[PDB]
Amino acid sequence: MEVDDRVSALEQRLQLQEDELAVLKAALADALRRLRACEEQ
Amino acid sequence: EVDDRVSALEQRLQLQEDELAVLKAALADALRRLRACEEQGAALR
Amino acid sequence: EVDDRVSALEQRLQLQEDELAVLKAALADALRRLRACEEQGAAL
Numbered sequence: 415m416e417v418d419d420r421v422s423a424l425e426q427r428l429q430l431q432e433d434e435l436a437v438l439k440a441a442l443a444d445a446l447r448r449l450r451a452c453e454e455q
Numbered sequence: 456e457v458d459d460r461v462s463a464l465e466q467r468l469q470l471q472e473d474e475l476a477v478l479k480a481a482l483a484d485a486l487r488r489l490r491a492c493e494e495q496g497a498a499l500r
Numbered sequence: 501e502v503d504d505r506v507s508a509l510e511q512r513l514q515l516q517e518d519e520l521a522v523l524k525a526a527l528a529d530a531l532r533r534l535r536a537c538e539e540q541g542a543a544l
């Protein structure tokens with residue numbers, strides 16, 4: 415049953431990673447749009 | 456069931472892996488485009 | 501047996517953490533340099 419705490423801990427840390435990835439994705443897609451609007455500029 | 460939770464974890468980890476691969480290739484493209492614009496900027500100066 | 505899967509997941513999660521860290525750091529620099537290019541084109 416100690417195993418249950420390690421699964422729980424993995425679930426929580428993974429959620430923080432998922433949230434961090436979502437944040438990066440939006441920042442990156444924004445950078446790409448700005449860059450594509452500097453290429454054409 | 457613990458096996459169901461570990462399975463659900465493995466699925467979420469695979470999807471994270473896909474996303475990271477894609478974001479990494481996308482970042483590489485972004486840096487290329489950035490370097491190009493910087494080189495254009497310095498040349499224009 | 502399920503502990504071997506859990507251990508393997510912990511080792512994978514940390515490698516993914518490290519990947520994201522490289523991505524985040526390089527993106528931070530790119531944005532800094534992006535702003536600079538925008539600002540030296542708004543003044544121009």
Ligand SMILES: [K+]
Pocket residue numbers: 437438441524527
């Ligand atoms: K970020």
